[PDB]
Each structure stands twice: as C-alpha cells, then as structure tokens.
Design a protein around this ligand. Structure first.
Ligand code: BJD
Length: 220
C-alpha cells in the first residue's frame, strides 16, 4: 500500500461537477467511480451521464432521481442496461426527466460491483490503492461541512449515518493529520477546487467507510 494516493495524478478523475438544486449526489458518486474504471481499462477519460442515472435508474433500483438514491443500485442499472451514456450526449439538467438512454452514445458498461465491509477503513484504503476511486456516503449535514475550505475535516458531531454521496479518489497524511481525498459534486468553489480532505482512521468519521462500493469493467 502506498502512503499516499491521488487518482487525479493518473488522469482517472474528471472535472468536478455542480449538482445544483437536485439531490442526485448518488448519481455523481456512481459515475465518478465508473469513469475511473473506464480510464483504467481503455486509457480514455470521459464524463459519464449522471442524468442517465437520474432519469433511468428509478423504482426498480430504489432510486428517486433528484430526491436521492444509492450508488450500488445505480451500478446494477448500468449492468442491467448494458451501458450508460456519456455526459456530453446525455447532459445534466438538475431535474427529473423521462429516460432518454440511447445505446448509440453508450460510453461505458459495468460488469459487477463490490460492496466493502462497514466501517473498515483499512479495507477502504486497500481498495482505493489497488482498485481505484470508491463510491461512499458521508454525514455531510453539519454546518462545518458546508463551510469547509481547507485542511483536514473533523466534526465532533458527525455520525456514521450517511446522507450525501461522494467519491474517495485517494488518501494521505497532511502534516500529521491522516485524510481521505474526497471529490464532491458542488462545483469547484466548494472546498479545495471541489474536493474535501476528510479525517481518516478516526473511527469511521462521518461514516465515510459505512457503505463503500466500486464498479468493475472485466476483460474476459
Ligand atoms: C441510515 S444508514 O444506516 O446510514 N444507511 C442504511 C443502509 C444503507 C444506507 C446506504 C446509503 C449509501 C449511500 C448514500 Cl448517499 C445514502 C444516502 C442518503 C441520504 C439519506 C438521507 C437524506 Cl435526507 C439524503 C438527502 N441528502 C441530504 C443532504 C444534502 C447535503 C448535505 C447533507 C445532507 C440522502 C445511503 N446504503 N445502505 C445499504 C443498503 C442500500 N439499499 C439500496 C436499495 O434500497 C434499499 C437500501 C443508509
């Protein structure tokens, strides 16, 4: 295991997106994870369509578009559907729409997904290092999360119950403060150009290791 990981250094992470007034964090978290796999497997980095997920991964997957959902079942949709469109072809409108999936513009598939054990920050570290970015939920409801600018985020009021989907794109230790490098979907003016470093190995802080999952694209 490397001491630090940052998947942006390997070109596996697309630009930070802006979810706006639609509670579709689950979709951004899922596409973020698959984007990294697509790049790993083909060398091409392309933004995948969060909107495709909002419109099409619905009641069969327990998802409710702009009213929330789950990364795991998002990946199952991609599996069942044999594909997801590129963001460019199926752009993001921050509102529920009719499903307009078009196989003509399918940019990625998903073979399977893996859910990691609850609260196991060691296992999360291993997956981030050896597999790629991991979809996770965090407890982001606290005012300190909204005001986060820099440093390593630690909120004594955080719980292990999650309420916002994000993407772990790495980890490190900022001068004696261990962190997870997290890509949010609140645009580049949140945190450090859209990213937040969140406390690592402090008892599953903000439930970051509560419900992790990552997709895979298998080659035979
Ligand atoms: C309450 S708990 O113990 O934290 N937990 C229970 C179990 C769980 C959970 C999750 C899971 C995974 C990822 C995410 Cl993003 C979520 C979520 C959520 C959520 C909850 C309440 C709310 Cl109100 C919201 C909406 N976001 C509000 C917000 C916006 C900005 C900042 C702060 C808050 C989202 C849940 N998977 N799982 C595993 C089971 C998933 N299946 C999927 C199929 O449908 C049944 C459950 C939640």
């Amino acid at each position: 295991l490397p001491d630090s990981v940052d998947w942006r250094e390997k070109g596996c992470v697309t630009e930070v997106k802006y979810q706006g007034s639609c509670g579709a964090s689950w979709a951004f978290s899922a596409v973020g994870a698959l984007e990294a796999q697509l790049k790993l497997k083909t060398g091409k980095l392309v933004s995948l369509s969060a909107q495709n997920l909002v419109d099409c991964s619905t009641e069969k997957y327990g998802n409710k578009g702009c009213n929330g959902g789950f990364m795991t079942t998002a990946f199952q949709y991609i599996i069942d559907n044999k594909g997801i469109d590129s963001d460019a072809s199926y752009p993001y409108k921050a509102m529920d729409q009719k499903c307009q999936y078009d196989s003509k513009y399918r940019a990625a598939t998903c073979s399977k997904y893996t859910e990691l054990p609850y609260g196991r920050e060691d296992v999360l570290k291993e997956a981030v290092a050896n597999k790629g970015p991991v979809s996770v939920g965090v407890d982001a409801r606290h005012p300190s999360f909204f005001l986060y600018r820099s440093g390593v985020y630690y909120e004594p009021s955080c719980t292990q119950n999650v309420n916002h989907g994000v993407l772990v794109v790495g980890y490190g230790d900022l001068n004696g403060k261990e962190y997870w490098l997290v890509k949010n979907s609140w645009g580049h003016n949140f945190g450090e150009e859209g990213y937040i470093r969140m406390a690592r190995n402090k008892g599953n802080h903000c439930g970051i290791a509560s419900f992790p999952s990552y997709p895979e694209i298998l080659q035979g």
